[PDB]
Amino acid sequence: NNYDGDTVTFSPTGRLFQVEYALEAIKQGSVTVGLRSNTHAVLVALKRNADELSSYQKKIIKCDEHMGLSLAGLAPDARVLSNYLRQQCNYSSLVFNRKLAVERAGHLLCDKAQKNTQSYGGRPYGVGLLIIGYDKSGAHLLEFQPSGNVTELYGTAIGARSQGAKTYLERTLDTFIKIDGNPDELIKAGVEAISQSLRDESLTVDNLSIAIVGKDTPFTIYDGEAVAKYI
Amino acid sequence: MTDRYSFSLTTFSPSGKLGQIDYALTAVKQGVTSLGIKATNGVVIATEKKSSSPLAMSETLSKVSLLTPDIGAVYSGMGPDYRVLVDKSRKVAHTSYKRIYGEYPPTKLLVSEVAKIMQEATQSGGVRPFGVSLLIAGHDEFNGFSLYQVDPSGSYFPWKATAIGKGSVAAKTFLEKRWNDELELEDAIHIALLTLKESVEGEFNGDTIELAIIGDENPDLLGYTGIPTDKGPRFRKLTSQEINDRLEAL
Amino acid sequence: TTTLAFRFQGGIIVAVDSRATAGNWVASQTVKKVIEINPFLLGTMAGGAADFQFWETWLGSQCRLHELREKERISVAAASKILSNLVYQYKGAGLSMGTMICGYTRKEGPTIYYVDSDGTRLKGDIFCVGSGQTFAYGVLDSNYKWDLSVEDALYLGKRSILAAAHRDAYSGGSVNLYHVTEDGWIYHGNHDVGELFWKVKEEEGSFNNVIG
Amino acid sequence: GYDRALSIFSPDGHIFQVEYALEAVKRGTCAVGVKGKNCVVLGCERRSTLKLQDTRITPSKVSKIDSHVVLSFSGLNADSRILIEKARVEAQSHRLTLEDPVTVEYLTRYVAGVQQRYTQSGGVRPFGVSTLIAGFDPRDDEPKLYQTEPSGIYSSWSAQTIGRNSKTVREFLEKNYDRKEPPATVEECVKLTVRSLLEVVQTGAKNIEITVVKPDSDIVALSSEEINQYVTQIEQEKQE
Amino acid sequence: GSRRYDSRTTIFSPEGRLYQVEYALESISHAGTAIGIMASDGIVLAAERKVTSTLLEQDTSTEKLYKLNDKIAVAVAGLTADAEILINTARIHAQNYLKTYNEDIPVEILVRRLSDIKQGYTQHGGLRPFGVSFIYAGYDDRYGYQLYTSNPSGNYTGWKAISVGANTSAAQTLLQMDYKDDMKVDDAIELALKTLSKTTDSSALTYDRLEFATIRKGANDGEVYQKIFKPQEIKDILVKTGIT
Amino acid sequence: QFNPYGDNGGTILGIAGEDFAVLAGDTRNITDYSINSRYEPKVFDCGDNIVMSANGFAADGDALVKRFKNSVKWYHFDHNDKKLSINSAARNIQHLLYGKRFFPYYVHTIIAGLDEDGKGAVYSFDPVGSYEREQCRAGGAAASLIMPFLDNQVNFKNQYEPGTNGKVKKPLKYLSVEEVIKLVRDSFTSATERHIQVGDGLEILIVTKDGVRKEFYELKRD
Amino acid sequence: TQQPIVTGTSVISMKYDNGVIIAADNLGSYGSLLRFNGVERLIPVGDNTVVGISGDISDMQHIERLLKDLVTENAYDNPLADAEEALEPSYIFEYLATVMYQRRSKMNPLWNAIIVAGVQSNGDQFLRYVNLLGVTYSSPTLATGFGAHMANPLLRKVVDRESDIPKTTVQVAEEAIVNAMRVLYYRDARSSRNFSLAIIDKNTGLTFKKNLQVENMKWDFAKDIKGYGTQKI
Amino acid sequence: DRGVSTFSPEGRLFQVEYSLEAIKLGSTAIGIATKEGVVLGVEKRATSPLLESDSIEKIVEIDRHIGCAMSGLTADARSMIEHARTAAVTHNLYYDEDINVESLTQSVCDLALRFGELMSRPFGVALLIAGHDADDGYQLFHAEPSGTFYRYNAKAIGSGSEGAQAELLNEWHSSLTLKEAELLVLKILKQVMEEKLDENNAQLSCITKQDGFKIYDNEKTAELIKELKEKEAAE
Ligand SMILES: [Mg+2]
Structure with missing residues (x-):
């Protein structure tokens, strides 16, 4: 009300409204799902188009051979944060001949978003990210909020109508975690999960976007007729 | 962090008034009375030592300050603003003059430098004006004795005699009646004490009054002998005893 | 190295050798000493090879930006001065450059600018730069006329490089010919000095000192 | 440094500081530009509220940017000097590097760029100035006349006016200027320029300034008596 | 943050005016009147000190008339402190020009420089403008005697x-x-003092309330002299012209 | 005084075929008269069907190869996983090298692969970035021993057809990958005999449309 | 640019079937003066890596602090700091190699020759060299300074190529290293009798041996040597 | 007042949303992509008959293989064009090749959100970036001041955008020829323009693989307008 003019101002109840408004931009964004087993980690994203002549906005970004994320919210902010990740992944490889741990990647994203919430002049990031990766401690899935909060999860979803997919994964938890050494079945579970967030529209060939990383699987994105198999 | 106040805090109002300068002058008006009188062979500057508490040692608080060996200053208004201005005034007398010309600045030019500092606080980013008016008395070879007033705006005027602060209006009227162009230094001191008594409520003695002069050279205060041209400072702060002696012949 | 360029009735002839040496060691016989800045402008290599390649490729980028902004072909005067002003900023740092910026525009006609890593910029009709420049100058000066044909002008440039290639130890390999017209430059082939020497010797009767 | 975003968008998509800069131009004295077949003429209004002026030394409204290009303006006088200075410097810089004087379009594009920069830079307000830039390109006999404005947009004009009551003189020019046959001579072009100012000026005495620019750096400013002869001839023909 | 307290000194009103410049001009309208009159054989500068006191040391005082160099002087109207900042900048420009070209700075060039500085404060920096208006009285060998004025707008x-x-x-x-083109300095002196005498808010115009100066070619042969009038000399010219 | 440069010896060789390209290099690494390693790989697969070697001062050689490999990675990020063509890689390397014009990478760089028409390609760089497409290029310590041999046996220089006596040149017939490898091996065998810094092992990287293949051969260890 | 002041001489090392051995004497020379006799020039990092340093000691001590600081930093927000995300020899080396080359490129080098010896997560032997120039190389045997000239020849007789590594036991490897240290004591004028030896085995882990001495020395033949040519007495 | 980079309660940047309103006030610009080329067309919209309409430059060349059309506060586009041209040329310098249309568009869009308290406000102009590369063929992009860019088969921006887009919805198919696209731009421009469409108040341009980017002559466009009139009167 009087305490939402900038990010440097706490409300009387101890809230940061600019951060909460940035959080709102994620809810407006298109749905994207993340889930993993012990061998693989999968991103499934519903891409959004402007109209029938337009292309479908890309949702998934590769950060390294073993790491990448899906976005929901302001796409330019995801480009900035993904570019930052790319560098940090790259710094670790060049300097330490070491692949950047997925947990440590989350710590870095958290700290970068935090500085934007405590200083005058700037603004919070207006995007949520789902980071998947496979490192020395197996498969991982992270959920990034522009408040700074990063959370390691078995599965999750962010965007509009994401609650439907999130409840499905909460039921399926015991099943999909056990899908080891079978990428197709893990993607199927991700496609079935994101389907719980759909209304009116359904998953078409240029609508759906899937990415996967695993034990002997580099981070690879599937679009177009490559995802027709899963429709 | 960073000083993000890079804009003026003093601005012209529709009526053409610079609010913060006016309000600074209002703060000066509330301040304790101080005065200056120029004689033919000297200048006197005086003020009341308004002690905030009797437990406080009012000798440690110097309202009358030496700027150069031949220049002194006194104020009315906010003491802390005065203290820093004295520090800056002393340094600027060296950096922008003595280190260049190998001699102390004349009264008018030092006053000009002080004024410039006060003007800048009236226009620069993220600062308020100084809440003081200064009375600067001094002597130099080519201009002789002089007395200057300096206001928060940075404006400065030379005076034969004047007063600032609490009871300035009444004090200036008193000085107009007594002042002439044939006054000796002792006569000006006598008039200064008379004028200052009117604005003082409580105790009136050498311990509650601070008074200094710009007069003859003081070789005893120089600290060394051997150089004929170096004859000592013309600034001298009167002692508590020296004031009380003249209060008997009052 | 031996590079030359001269103005004539039919435009400009540019001719260069192809040799590159590191001390006495012949590093390459197939070096390109003509940079094709763009379809209308040419530049020659002498002194530093990288300095030439880098900054004249860069010059082509600056010329392209000029004609995008001004909707007009850049003048040879302007193109040359961009390069000379650049190297002048680097003066002292140790850039090595001796080049002819060659071009043909409407307002100027055929124009040649000698540009130098010392900051020198000279307009002229005939220029020769390199370790074998003095040998090329001799043939040029004695045979040059404004009213040369394109065929004869091309041969004169070829023959003048051959003269240097023979005598100058640090020149040779092959001869590259260019002919600059208003509609652009035209490449006139790579000519091996080994085969060219014997061909010229026989047909021209020159080099009687040499046994063939 | 002072970084405050003064020029910003409003809910309706307007940048008020740029629009309020145009209002400063509207207040400024009228300026007019008319290009003939082999010349361009720049007319300028001098408000007669200021007498006892020294016209020798008082800043003239039309300014030479180079020997072949001129710039007149309407709006804040102090602001115009900054644009004129930058333009004059850029004109010499262009001659130094390109070895050729600026085209009128290039000089216009530069000034318009400066004006634009001040509409989205921190800690600065836009220029309260619209300009008329006229001249002839090097080795070219085609007349050139361009206009700029605080927002930074610029364009070419057969004839144009800016400043106070510019609506009226533009009305006049729109009916009196023929594109198929522009003012063939210097006389015809100057006459049409004076006529257009006489719709607005008040008295035709010292209130009208005329500057004629011709090809090959041939620029001259008309005197009071020369202009007064045009004023006399126009009104004598009008009495009919 | 800090934005809350920003007056925004460099913005346009809806009408297209610069608020702070307009208000600075209002400030200047309450300042002592300064007059400049240019004649064929010199320039006069006359100015009124604001409600003075009898204890003010007049002979050593200077609030209105300032010397920029040997050829150029200025009369001030507004904040004296602001004027001195600009005056010292102007004095330096004159010396920079003299050092560079080995010739005294032309009057207009100096005036344009100071006026451009004032302009800058109205367009950028977020600071308040200088609440000062100058009358420049000067001479050079190009235009001869010149009078200019600048105000906070630049x-x-x-x-x-x-x-x-x-x-x-x-x-x-x-x-x-009362002004005419063929007028002389002695006549302009009389006009300047007569004008102040009628426009003054004081009861009567006296020597102690005035600063006066003349730039004359009335110097021995082809050269220019600046004369800042002393209190006694202002008293004499007041009697001569018949005002006191 | 500190000398930031050193000489790690070694010798490399690139040869462009008709539809293939080879980039070879010995595996010996040295300082002065001591051997540091008998097997220290010098020719590297940089992805996108490009192979690279930066011979000379190994610290600058390693630094450059690392930065180029990095440039390939970021080219993919910035330009939608587009394949970096050999000619584009060559221009990019020029800027990497010229970037340090006044404190150069003390290396003689060679890359090899296929051009956009599928033909064999070899590019050769100097220490400060001047580069050029070539058919044949030896680099490093024994370059002066190998190049003349290659002029003679690859380009058939000074060779004429019997009977004609200097009138007809030997025709420039195309060499197979098996034929090139023979010439590479004999070049390195000869260089090993007559150059002290050459020996231990030969590693060849062969580039075709099918990908990058490696071959290793022993060399004399004295 | 500087000059080294307090210096450490040869570091020698080699691979064997299950791991690596590294050794270096305990001397800190001050020119020809054998100033400091209790200097440890093998610095272990975790339980899987030993970094052996020669050259300027003040720069060694700086590098020692960087490695100590590296372990601390790796532990921050790292639940697997003593498991999967522990520091590897390859990580430690690459970090040093970066620093060494950066410092030489600023014309202000760390005046050292470093050998990082260790065993990786998968049991692979790690042995690589880096020096003040940022030059790096790997080999079955590695040695700095005089060790390069005298130790390598002896160590290469045991492991002459990659295929000899599985055939070389820890007893044979340690014997060769100890013999090499004796040879360097005979012949390097900037060496000491006292040294340290470290073994990093994939099965038995890190074994760090301090206060070792060169023994079984041959000097008796010296008594028979008289004069410099013609002298008999 | 309030921050420049402030979020609204709905989760949108005020300044970006306001700049989109300025773009709605701008003159109409239409782009149509086909397999034979991409066509760009604009409404010039001269404010007076004395304004020489050929000086109105709302279609602009970035490189030989990339063209650009603008709508909104066109003065703001000049620095965007400059950057685009610099990026296209710089990439050619570094990589000896043409730069991808998407990569160019991405480089331009990176400028968009570089505003705060960098520039003081977002851009008040939208761009239709059309071009061709070997990887993805003929492409048309719409670059906004939000930093977002969408690829389109066809797209209209400016005052008559939603009406024109609805028309493009029906008319566009994957087998359009270049000539068919030219007439279609002219048809829809004529529909949404206030003044009557002719060769002086409207402009056409295209980008083909062979000839590259070309702005159409007023004589060439005039013939296409006459061809349009006849085919509409034909039924
Ligand atoms: Mg050998």
């Missing part, structure tokens, strides 16, 4: 006779009435 213009400060409307009418 706009300057040339004049034959001009006033700044208080009652400029009344003063400018009186000057416009």
